[PDB]
Amino acid sequence: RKTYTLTDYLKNTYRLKLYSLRWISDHEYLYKQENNILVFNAEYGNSSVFLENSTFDEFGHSINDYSISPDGQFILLEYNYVKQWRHSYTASYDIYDLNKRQLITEERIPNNTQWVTWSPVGHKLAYVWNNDIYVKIEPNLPSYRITWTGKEDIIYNGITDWVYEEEVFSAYSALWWSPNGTFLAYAQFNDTEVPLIEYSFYSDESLQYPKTVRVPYPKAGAVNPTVKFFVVNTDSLSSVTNATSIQITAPASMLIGDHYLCDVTWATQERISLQWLRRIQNYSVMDICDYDESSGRWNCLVARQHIEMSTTGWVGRFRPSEPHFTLDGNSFYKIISNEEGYRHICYFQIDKKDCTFITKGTWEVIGIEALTSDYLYYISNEYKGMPGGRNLYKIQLSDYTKVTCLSCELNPERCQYYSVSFSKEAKYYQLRCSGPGLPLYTLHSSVNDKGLRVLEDNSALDKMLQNVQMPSKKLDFIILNETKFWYQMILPPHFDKSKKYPLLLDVYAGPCSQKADTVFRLNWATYLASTENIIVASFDGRGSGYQGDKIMHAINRRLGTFEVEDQIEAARQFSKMGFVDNKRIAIWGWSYGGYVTSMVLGSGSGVFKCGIAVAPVSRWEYYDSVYTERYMGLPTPEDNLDHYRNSTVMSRAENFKQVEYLLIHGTADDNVHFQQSAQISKALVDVGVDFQAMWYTDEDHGIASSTAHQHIYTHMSHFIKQCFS
Amino acid sequence: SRKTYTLTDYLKNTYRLKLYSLRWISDHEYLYKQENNILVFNAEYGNSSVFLENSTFDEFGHSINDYSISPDGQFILLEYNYVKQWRHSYTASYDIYDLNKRQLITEERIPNNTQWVTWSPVGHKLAYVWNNDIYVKIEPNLPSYRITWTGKEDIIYNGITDWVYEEEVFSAYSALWWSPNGTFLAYAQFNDTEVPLIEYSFYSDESLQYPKTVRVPYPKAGAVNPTVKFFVVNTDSLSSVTNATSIQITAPASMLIGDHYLCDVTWATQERISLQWLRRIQNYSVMDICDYDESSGRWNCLVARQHIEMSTTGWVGRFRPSEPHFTLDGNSFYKIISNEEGYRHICYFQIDKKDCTFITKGTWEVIGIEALTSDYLYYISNEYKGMPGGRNLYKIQLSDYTKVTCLSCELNPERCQYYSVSFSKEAKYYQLRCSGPGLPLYTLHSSVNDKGLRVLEDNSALDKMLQNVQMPSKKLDFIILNETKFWYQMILPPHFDKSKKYPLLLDVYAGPCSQKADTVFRLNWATYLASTENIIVASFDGRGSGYQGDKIMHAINRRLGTFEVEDQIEAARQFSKMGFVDNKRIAIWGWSYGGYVTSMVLGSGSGVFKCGIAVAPVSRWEYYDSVYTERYMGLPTPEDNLDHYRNSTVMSRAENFKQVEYLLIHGTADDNVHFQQSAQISKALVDVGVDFQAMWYTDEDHGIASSTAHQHIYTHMSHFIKQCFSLP
Ligand SMILES: CC(C)(C)OC[C@@H]1C(=O)NCCN1C(=O)C[C@H](N)Cc1cc(F)c(F)cc1F
């Protein structure tokens, strides 16, 4: 009866099986079989080989990924993959003509391409090379150069810079096809005056001299990149004259100061929706711009604007939600925080200001998943009032009282956390259950909500897990100021509540974050409970999301206060539970969780014995502007410079004499720069506090390389076991 | 004797060694700082006098870092805003104070951001370097004359050295050399146009939002080196012409065939300057004595005055060809060179004669020439009692080299076995500086009879404090390996009992031509480990160490990381077989070169060592600068010695680190041994999955000498040593 060991987690012994499918039409999806790609008929479950690996085993390159054209007449081959940031990367591409059954060797896609994408229909092709946009009406024909101002580290056409990739759009891409591929909208970011963050990269041992990486990176209060938006007609590309792009400008209420482009969504074939967001991220405006044939220009009627603001904090969770327009584009549904601070779906009209909420309650709609003529499919945490749960719902557009949950009752014993993937027209949908039981994948029919087939049930994994002493998970809540605050505990096998165990507080506690959910996980905490009999707990206090703006906006303009104090208060109640050794309580966290961990260890509460901080934030003036300023405003005396200086971990170095501290950070961290940890170590030296440290050469914010990953979790294990004796 | 020497005592500097730093201003007088007030002493009778009261500048507005009085005693340079650059370079602000008027200058002042200042040997002329250019002030209050115009940041250095020359060649920031009487100003010019830049982050105070990137021209092994030119300008002509002409002195033809260095500048007379050049392959150097042609105003270097100093079994010199010591007429000089037996002694040269004659000989070496008179030549050596780790002052008679007398051997034989000396102007008096094995002792002497005039400082106050302290003892002895004496030292804990088993810490450096076992008395981290933690701190000078003959120093030639590393392991086994060493508790730590050796030792698989600490270590020799590395390893090309470059990396031994506890420490702002080197060590240990302890120090250089970091590193290393030795 072995236990889940550290080797199991580091070597991925027990692996969850997925069912990652991509919908091709309203009733077909592609699936990978390790040797080929199969086309599945959603209605009957039969399949047929769409493309076998014996088609590119002669290529001479390692196939990184494939991209079928919407009409299934070409495929895009990705190779020479080179990662950049969280989403950005670079690769080489080769289009394979499914009709000629051979590669396209004429007018090939250039090497070092930054982003490629088909049109929504047909086989048009837009790609970004050297920060300039190109369009191919045909894969074999020459490409049409759309932009000419592309310049590395300054001008970005069709691609996002660093801050927009990480904080706004969560993608390298800045291209938006029209529904039928006629128009191609894109954004232009300009980092001319944006200060560059510089750090050393050491590379392989052969490199005699280290290289200096420089990235345009606006820290809190620095000069942000400017943005422009354009739309070009891809049906009239002139082979003789240059392409003519039409610029859509932001509303007057946004040009008064610094602002952002935070959302782009096409309504109809000639109507596109833009959402702008002031640098003070509590005021946003949606523009609905239509095309005018007689003038070849895009106009955004003032009467069709839509303001979305907040007085308790920022607008949106991390950005204003995306709209879902109706068939005629004259109406749309989108998630906005209601009057009491609970985010729900509001029915909008293109012409009028007032919207009408179609959902209500002391819970939140996580996201709108699909929209049809009669139904609106969304995910929420309404079932059993558990904020850590996720279920799929359908609300009738003609009668808001007819709401139906499509996943609540399928298997309430093993499934409480759901995601979904709909077909092209939402005729079928795949449900992705991920807890508390083993993940489960099912295929359903939208017309009657009947379960067609079981795609993946992890029955093979369930069998192996029966021969290992696996830990349990306890999801509950405690009361703070007459408010429910949820927590979770990874409990060791054979848990005895009369026995006493060491407790480790696994923390993140970022704004709109959630560490207490019903998701089933096989992670480092699994090993700590199964093998080391350690209770690893997580707590969602003030600042956590999916529980209303009263809890989420509580940390507005005062990061590093309530969410830090609540972690201490929660661990304080944990120590008085009888099964927790109050002399052996630790706390560790990554990224924002490293900041909270360091602020807790420097709080002088005396509750924690030791703690680990991995790639932590130490001084909010060091992190990027879009994220920091969203919760802290500007670091100016006339704004919020007080909390900026009052919430550093360096100012608490003196209180680090009570605890054992392990500080870890990667030298190539483009996100939370090594500077942050270098200033923490320097402050502890100035006050004479001893501590443990560890850098990782050329590792980024993830420290995700195979060898480094195993090394850090091995090093942290020794630190924890040594602190618990 | 109840209290031990605690770690706190070392970090807080409870027991301070008393010093006596004097500055000879004339033939019989020197300056001395009593209590912020500069005193002038008469060596003949000891009576003093006030030269600058302590309140003269306590109302200056700035904290004075150091003073510099003109040789004629009419002015005094006051530098403030001192900011250390490299080991010797620094930037500061300066002010000239007129002594004949007791006022500041306030007119045509020395510009801010001045990189170097220096007086003329006589008078009160002034030459300084600003924005990589040279300026000369005839009078401290009159406008200055610009000598160079090619000065360019990080590209052209005029009057100052670049990073390599400062660290590896001249051991000084200054590249200026006044003529003896001050008529001529000889300077060097360095061009780092194509020299690659080392780049690393500097974070500064936490108020700085964006980390700063430091960029320094740093030629690593094999990279392109800086080029050098030499010039001489006549400062007496600055007044009558608008742009004085600087006469260039080119190097001999035997140096222009390839890359070379300028390794020594030494004036001989008022119109005779000698330059020593060195090929990039540092086994061939050439001295070039040049005279001033009063007729044509040029400098000519007669081929018959050349002197070739080479080596057939390694590099030439210790760290560089030694400097010559000319007589008054400048027609002959004495110089330290390696003899046919490989022992460095003093040779007597004539300006024309290619052959010299050695005046000293034996299985021992001369450390340096101190003073030269018409009668005697004073030098320091380790001849006494055949102890390579001892230092004594000798006096050899010029008219009969068989008449050699030791001036410090028998002064205090039990208390003093390590000596340095500071002679007066014409060597009429000298101060003997004793530094071990007993407490430091300073004495003044008259060179007429070498009579002990008086005791300037005897550390009597410090002696009484150490009476009620359990200080450690020191054993300086040797072992015989392959029929050769190799010396070692041990800091033995108090009440040392050979019937007991003690833990052993092996303090290592073992760089080429270095010495860790000597007679110097020290109050350092080793004193605490022995006095309080009962740990024996041992050091061993194996193959590669200096002051013992070329057969030992040149042993590791082109083989760094081999003989010196293995000799350290063998010394540990030798110490374990002595009886009083616990075999299961032997550690080894080292700084800089010692960190490299420590890492190579811990990655050797010897099984001798349980743990080890490496501070600012070298990882591979292709990461270190050219002039130092190539001197011992040649060029990292396949045709010469690339194989030994790649074979002696610590990364290549990463697998063996699974058998030891490893602590790696390095400062992020290390300009000497770049953080890159420790960054490659850790990344290699991660690639093979071996756990280890790490510690970076933000914005600390190769010394990690900031008050707070210094206390932090020795506190951190103490915990690691005590836990590895199971020490409570
Ligand atoms: C990216 C992620 C988690 C996968 O989810 C996206 C999520 C989201 O909801 N919208 C867009 C972006 N996003 C964020 O969380 C942005 C933050 N920069 C994440 C973050 C916060 C820190 F405090 C910190 F120190 C480092 C750090 F990286």
Ligand SMILES: CC(C)(C)OC[C@@H]1C(=O)NCCN1C(=O)C[C@H](N)Cc1cc(F)c(F)cc1F
């Ligand atoms: C500077 C010192 C000690 C005070 O003595 C001067 C001494 C000398 O004798 N002549 C001139 C220069 N010099 C040297 O030792 C030069 C070396 N760069 C020192 C050194 C060696 C390393 F292997 C290493 F990793 C780092 C490092 F700094």
